[PDB]
């Protein structure tokens, strides 16, 4: 343990937590929340960004001076990844897009990029690697999203033996795409069961997995405290919002039930209390305003 990485302080903004974390794709939603949680305890965060620097502007007040280092990177440029991760002691992978594009399809964003990041981090001698996948990721799924997630997480686990794979079920928050997708529809009802998990709980679970040394090589499953049927969930969403972009893959994903994985550790094994939807739905959907809770199975 080097002297510059030994923690000090009282865990405040100006303290030292001794974490050198490279967060890939930190300009998104989960990346923004992870950078906010990492910067408040006094950690060194290295953010490789592909978009405009202005879109990274909101990442500046997340920490103290010099604790967030923005640098350019490219998905198919291995040397940029070697540049980014050769000084960090933990790498977090959050790269993912909900829809395919002309330059980056689902395979190149879910298979090639995570495997390349893991291989580069393995060659650079990093200590802790975290890869974010989906809970319902299966090889034999009907949609491309879960297929590519399953293949990518298999390749990541094969490439890095100590890779901690984190599987959120479905995440709701201020800048999410689950409750904001439902409330803005003004697809249909089915028999699917889902158990959403609060974004702050996922971020705290990731941070608690960073802190402990016993979580290396595991495969967690971040699921919410209560399971909801889709019809009651969308009725609750429309009732909170005081109301009377899409693709085929999202349509398939909405009509897929959330699987149960009892053999894998969850949020309670990391000391995280799963916040229910009824305590945060008002905060999430107060923007849409110009109530009985949903029934749980």
């Amino acid at each position: 343990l080097h002297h510059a990485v030994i923690p000090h302080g009282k865990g405040g903004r100006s303290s030292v937590s001794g974490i050198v974390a490279t967060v890939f794709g930190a300009t998104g939603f989960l990346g923004r929340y992870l950078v906010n949680h990492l910067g408040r305890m006094g950690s060194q965060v290295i953010v490789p960004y592909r978009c405009e620097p202005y879109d990274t502007m909101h990442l500046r007040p997340m920490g103290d001076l010099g604790q967030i280092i923005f640098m350019d990177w490219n998905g198919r440029d291995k040397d940029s990844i070697r540049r980014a991760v050769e000084h960090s002691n933990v790498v977090i992978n959050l790269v993912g897009r909900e829809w395919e594009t002309k330059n980056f399809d689902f395979e190149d964003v879910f298979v090639k990029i995570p495997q390349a990041i893991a291989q580069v981090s393995k060659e650079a001698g990093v200590e802790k690697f975290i890869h974010i996948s989906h809970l319902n990721a299966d090889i034999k799924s009907s949609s491309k999203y879960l297929r590519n997630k399953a293949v990518g997480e298999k390749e990541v686990r094969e490439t890095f033996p100590e890779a901690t794979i984190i599987k959120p079920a479905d995440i709701f928050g201020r800048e999410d795409r689950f409750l904001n997708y439902f409330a803005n529809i003004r697809s249909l009802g089915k028999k699917t069961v889902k158990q959403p998990v609060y974004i702050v709980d996922v971020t705290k679970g990731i941070i608690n997995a960073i802190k402990d040394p016993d979580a290396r090589g595991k495969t967690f499953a971040f699921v919410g405290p209560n399971r909801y049927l889709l019809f009651d969930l969308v009725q609750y969403v429309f009732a909170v919002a005081h109301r009377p972009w899409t693709t085929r893959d999202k349509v398939e994903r909405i009509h897929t039930t959330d699987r149960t994985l009892p053999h894998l550790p969850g949020l309670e094994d990391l000391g995280v209390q799963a916040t229910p939807l009824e305590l945060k739905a008002i905060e999430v959907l107060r923007r849409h305003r110009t109530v009985q809770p949903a029934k749980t199975v």
Binding site: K10, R13, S14, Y33, H37, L65
Partner: protein, 208 residues
């Protein structure tokens, strides 16, 4: 003595001493000490229980006419049991004079408000509360005026540190500015600048 020393005034010293004797002999109930400084300033140290009459006398006597209120200053001296020194500064326009009235008050005991004498103090002592915690009884509207709304404690007390106990920073998770414990990037370097040698022989305290 002539070129580089400020000249001394003696007729103003005599007139201020005469008026101090006149005040001390005209209100023996509340006056405790009367002093005239070297630079011709008169200070009257009186009891707190006469905060209202004495100043009212200076507001309404024919020979005083201290119509204007200049200052309302609180001085915190922790080594006394009455650690707060409330000081009024009065200005008389007819006779063109300045006077200083001093009283002592600790944390818990209140002092009667001087709003009915000078209305300007209706703001001034309000700030005193917001800086010292000295309660002013029968004040019309006494609340904080300078510090933050959620501020705990009083800053100008000598046991209060220079930097506060909380700092404000914006958090995106709660989408709000929030208070956190203070953690400075650089500690305020305390400079030991007191000379170990005696400076003024005429100001020497007697030994214990």
């Amino acid at each position: 003595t002539r070129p580089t020393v400020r000249p001394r005034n003696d007729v103003a010293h005599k007139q201020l001493s005469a008026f101090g004797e006149y005040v001390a002999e005209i209100l023996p109930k509340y006056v405790q000490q009367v002093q005239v400084s070297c630079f011709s300033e008169l200070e009257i140290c009186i009891h707190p229980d006469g905060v209202i009459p004495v100043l009212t006398f200076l507001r309404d006597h024919s020979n005083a006419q201290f119509k204007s209120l200049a200052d309302l200053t609180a001085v915190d001296i922790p080594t006394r049991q009455n650690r707060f020194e409330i000081v009024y500064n009065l200005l008389s326009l007819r006779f063109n004079s300045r006077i200083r009235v001093k009283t002592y008050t600790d944390e818990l005991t209140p002092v009667e408000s001087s709003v009915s004498v000078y209305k300007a103090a209706n703001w001034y002592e309000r700030e005193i509360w917001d800086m010292f915690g000295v309660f002013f009884a029968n004040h019309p509207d006494l609340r904080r005026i300078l510090t933050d709304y959620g501020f705990e404690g009083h800053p100008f007390r000598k046991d209060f540190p220079l930097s506060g106990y909380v700092e404000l920073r914006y958090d995106d998770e709660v989408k709000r500015v929030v208070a956190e414990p203070v953690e400075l990037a650089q500690e305020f370097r305390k400079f030991d600048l007191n000379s170990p040698w005696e400076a003024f022989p005429a100001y020497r305290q007697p030994p214990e």
